[PDB]
Amino acid sequence: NATMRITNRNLKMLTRQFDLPKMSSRFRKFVRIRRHPNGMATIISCDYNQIKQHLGPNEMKHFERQFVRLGFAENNGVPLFAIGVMENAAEALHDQFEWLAKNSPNTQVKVGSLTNKQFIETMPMKKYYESAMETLDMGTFRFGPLMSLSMVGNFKEMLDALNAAPFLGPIMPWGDFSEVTSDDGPIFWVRPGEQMVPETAFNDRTNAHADQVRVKSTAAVGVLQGIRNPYYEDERKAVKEVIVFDAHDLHKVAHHLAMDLYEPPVSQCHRWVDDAILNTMRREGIRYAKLELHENDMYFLPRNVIHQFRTVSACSSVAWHVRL
Numbered sequence: 001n002a003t004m005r006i007t008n009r010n011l012k013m014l015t016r017q018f019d020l021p022k023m024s025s026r027f028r029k030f031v032r033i034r035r036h037p038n039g040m041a042t043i044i045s046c047d048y049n050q051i052k053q054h055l056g057p058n059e060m061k062h063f064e065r066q067f068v069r070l071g072f073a074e075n076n077g078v079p080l081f082a083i084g085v086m087e088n089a090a091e092a093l094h095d096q097f098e099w100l101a102k103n104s105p106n107t108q109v110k111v112g113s114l115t116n117k118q119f120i121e122t123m124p125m126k127k128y129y130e131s132a133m134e135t136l137d138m139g140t141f142r143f144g145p146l147m148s149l150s151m152v153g154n155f156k157e158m159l160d161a162l163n164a165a166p167f168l169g170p171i172m173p174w175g176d177f178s179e180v181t182s183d184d185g186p187i188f189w190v191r192p193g194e195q196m197v198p199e200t201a202f203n204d205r206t207n208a209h210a211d212q213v214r215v216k217s218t219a220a221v222g223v224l225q226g227i228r229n230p231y232y233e234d235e236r237k238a239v240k241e242v243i244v245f246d247a248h249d250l251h252k253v254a255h256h257l258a259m260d261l262y263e264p265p266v267s268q269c270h271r272w273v274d275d276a277i278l279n280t281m282r283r284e285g286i287r288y289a290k291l292e293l294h295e296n297d298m299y300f301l302p303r304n305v306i307h308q309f310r311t312v313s314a315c316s317s318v319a320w321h322v323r324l
């Protein structure tokens with residue numbers, strides 16, 4: 001009731017100014033739109049675990065397409081939403097980390113160090129997976145992150161799985177909503193979670209950036225799986241803490257953080273954004289949202305949303321760009 005009332009309130013406020021894509025009354029009740037209390041950017045989400053209990057397979061495909069079309073809605077070239085989240089949508093997706101360990105075990109992967117930024121270790125995928133399993137305990141594992149592995153360069157089975165998953169088909173780089181380029185991905189990686197290491201902190205973080213085709217801004221889409229050694233969904237772990245900035249504030253945010261958007265993402269921003277900075281940025285009228293993403297969630301980031309991710313529990317990500 002309250003969720004629907006708040007979603008309807010926000011839809012009414014947006015429609016007073018902007019022409020939004022349409023959605024049936026029956027589907028609208030599955031959509032959650034809210035503004036972040038402190039930052040005031042707008043988050044759109046849904047819960048696949050709830051949807052799948054009410055909609056048949058053809059109806060769900062219709063919902064998923066309308067949801068993605070609404071979540072990428074723009075006015076005057078500017079996304080209205082700062083992030084879209086499909087909660088639980090990857091629940092039925094096969095275990096991707098295990099798939100790579102069993103089906104591509106000898107692939108040489110690059111692994112970061114928990115203690116030295118300048119160290120990169122090469123080893124077979126299978127040995128990385130065994131190392132992560134061996135050190136996994138209470139939501140983190142005591143081993144380095146896996147550097148991103150392109151799935152597009154056998155991996156067909158992983159791309160087919162994503163292609164068939166909820167929401168994703170139309171917004172794959174080759175999907176119906178795409179204007180198309182292997183630079184788009186998908187890419188796969190694994191993060192072990194922030195943790196103290198024997199003690200010093202391992203910070204598990206991606207600085208603020210805008211995603212780009214390299215230069216044109218682009219949308220990004222991601223899939224999160226918790227790391228598990230082979231269950232109440234409402235208690236599933238938070239895996240990322242996310243800060244997204246309203247796309248309308250791209251230039252204000254970049255100027256405040258002294259970002260060089262010509263740099264590649266990794267070197268666009270040299271300042272970590274924390275609540276002190278967010279509160280100072282708010283005084284300039286910048287809007288943002290801060291939220292957690294949980295295991296088995298999918299998400300997407302419209303173009304020109306500057307965003308910053310922190311890994312708070314061990315997870316795998318599969319992510320790509322889509323030129324809508």
Ligand SMILES: O=C(O)CCC(=O)C(=O)O
Pocket residue numbers: 205206211220221222240301307309310317319
């Ligand atoms: O997950 C991360 O650490 C960054 C993910 C991201 O930045 C994206 O999906 O565009």
Ligand SMILES: [Fe+2]
Pocket residue numbers: 209210211220307
């Ligand atoms: Fe990104």
